[PDB]
């Protein structure tokens, strides 16, 4: 059975976030899918540093 891992982090814009998601889905189809899944998350930038 698969074990979930959650790589994925800050990008620039929403289009870039969708492109990142499609890229990780492309990276799943090759080689393993029955041991590891590695779904990905995202979040966009903010001006204030401490908020980031």
């Amino acid at each position: 059975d698969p074990k979930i891992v959650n790589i994925g982090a800050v990008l620039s814009t929403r289009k870039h976030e969708q492109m990142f998601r499609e890229a990780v889905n492309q990276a799943n189809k090759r080689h393993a899918s029955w041991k590891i899944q590695l779904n990905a998350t995202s979040v966009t930038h903010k001006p204030n540093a401490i908020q980031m």
Partner: antibody, heavy 115, light 110 residues
Framework: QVQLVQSGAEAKKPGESLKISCKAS????????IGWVRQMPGSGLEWIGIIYPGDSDTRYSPSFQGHVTISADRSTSTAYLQWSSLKASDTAMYYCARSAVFDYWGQGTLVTVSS | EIVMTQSPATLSVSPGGRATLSCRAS??????LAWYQQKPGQAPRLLIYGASTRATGIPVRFSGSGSGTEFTLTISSLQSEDFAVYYCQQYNNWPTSWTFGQGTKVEIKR
């Protein structure tokens, strides 16, 4: 929790074309290499096809290349299988895989073509 | 394009012995393999993938070994519930090949 309930059994007269439905549940349908496997009465196994149900990228087996009509709906998670013709002497039983190591299997669906 | 040879054709053991089967490799098929159990009138299951790792929910008796040359599993202390047909199958260039075998068969002794 994964279930791969197939369609009920059916037999047909020679010549016609048939459809087989392998419904899925419990997981994101558009992430795993669904396939099919054959079994003749009192014999071994053979591989039919496989279809990554994200972009319908199929890769048929050379044994039945260009003879079957594998496909996969994205909405209801019901990757089908359709016949064209010449299905006369092919009485057997068919299963649907899950993930290219066959972690989960379905049930019994028998196809019998006779006069 | 590779033919899997499965031997022996039909074994037989007493309820409490052991077993030792064989999937002869016509080539050096990397280190990828599988081993399937199937009882009459039922859908097979998964036992070992990669020839060395156990799938979750499989009792501890089943184990195997192999390095791309006639890998082998040994069911130790075969109980009553076991003894149905077996199968071996490889996966090296996927998706291209998906070649199965013929598999042995185990029957109780009396």
């Amino acid at each position: 929790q994964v279930q791969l309930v197939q369609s009920g059994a059916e037999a047909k007269k020679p010549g016609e074309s048939l459809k087989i439905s392998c419904k899925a549940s419990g997981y994101s349908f558009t992430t795993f290499w669904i396939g099919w496997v054959r079994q003749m009465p009192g014999s071994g196994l053979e591989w039919i096809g496989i279809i990554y149900p994200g972009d319908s990228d199929t890769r048929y087996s050379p044994s039945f290349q260009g003879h079957v009509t594998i496909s996969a709906d994205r909405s209801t998670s019901t990757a089908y299988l359709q016949w064209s013709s010449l299905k006369a002497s092919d009485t057997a039983m068919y299963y649907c895989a899950r993930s290219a190591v066959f972690d989960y299997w379905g049930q019994g669906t028998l196809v019998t073509v006779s006069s | 394009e590779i033919v899997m040879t499965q031997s022996p054709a039909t074994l037989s053991v007493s309820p409490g012995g052991r077993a030792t089967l064989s999937c002869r490799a016509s080539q050096s098929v990397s280190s990828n393999l599988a081993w399937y159990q199937q009882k009459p009138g039922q859908a097979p299951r998964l036992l070992i993938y990669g020839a060395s790792t156990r799938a979750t929910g499989i009792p501890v008796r089943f184990s195997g070994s192999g390095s791309g040359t006639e890998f082998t599993l040994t069911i130790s202390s075969l109980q009553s519930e076991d003894f149905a047909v077996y199968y071996c199958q490889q996966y090296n260039n996927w998706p291209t090949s998906w070649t199965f075998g013929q598999g042995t068969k185990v029957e109780i002794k009396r």
